């Protein structure tokens, strides 16, 4: 033998990358690259947690979690962006429970949104598969990795075969075009077709609600905690928190404050948030409305926060 572990570690470790991929071996500390592709999630907090500024384009994302925790509110946002930037979004509904005016308020352009309501789970994966091949799409989202039942099981082993099939036959395709895919999975525990997905998924988000956003009266919404358990595009395990107001989505202004203080730019103490000499207000909800009505200063915080971190 001879070399200093390191010089022999990164040698093989590099050997690994060549043979299996990029995100194969990683040292959780790394700042590792930035592929100019990434869909903001609307949550500066989350997409800085993803390590690239948003959900990677040309990968398959899995957003699991209990109900009423936000998974979709995110996806719906996800669409809102990659769509407000010239992209074409397709939503493969198998839940039949999408609210438009909720979406309308999050930035999605419903009218130029492709909605399909498959009959089988085998069909849903196809129109999604042939639809993802036209390269026309940017972001496609399948609602309910669960509500994708095969034909049998409606006349007379299971889905994780259907899924597995669909995934292989689609992961390849998915990236030659550049369409990142989202899958909402959910309530089969709390404290189906997994297998396949749990392994193709380049990134897996754990969206669980933590607290009901009280607002003097009863409450404006809910605060969510996402844990990116699997990340192949950067270092995994980072987590992020943010607020969701009842019918108004992820609170941008509110998200900046959190980031605005945990990184300095905004000073507290006295329950009086103050952005360098200039105060905002007393009570996160009042300095939240200060940002909400002052995009000017707001941008600046958001601006500084991204420099200080991920471009
Ligand atoms: N039409 C609506 N009106 C008001 N608030 C809504 C509406 N749709 C969703 N919300 C809020 O958004 C949050 C959860 O987003 P959901 O769509 O339920 O995401 P999940 O991803 O939690 O979804 P299932 O899986 O529960 S739809 C809740 O805290 C709700 O208050």
From Swiss-Prot:
Chain residues that bind phosphate: 68-72, 186
Binding-site list for ATP: 68-73, 99-102
Disruption phenotype: Not essential in the absence of DNA damage, its deletion renders cells much more sensitive to DNA damaging agents such as UV light, ionizing radiation, alkylating agents and DNA gyrase inhibitors and desiccation-induced DSBs. 5-fold decrease in survival, loss of HR, no change in NHEJ (non-homologous end-joining) or single-strand annealing DSB repair.
Record keywords, A-Z: ATP-binding, Cytoplasm, DNA damage, DNA recombination, DNA repair, DNA-binding, Nucleotide-binding, SOS response
Record carries keyword Cytoplasm: yes
GO molecular function, one term: ATP hydrolysis activity
Similarity comment: Belongs to the RecA family.
Protein name: Protein RecA
Organism: Mycolicibacterium smegmatis (strain ATCC 700084 / mc(2)155)
Organism ancestry: Bacteria, Bacillati, Actinomycetota, Actinomycetes, Mycobacteriales
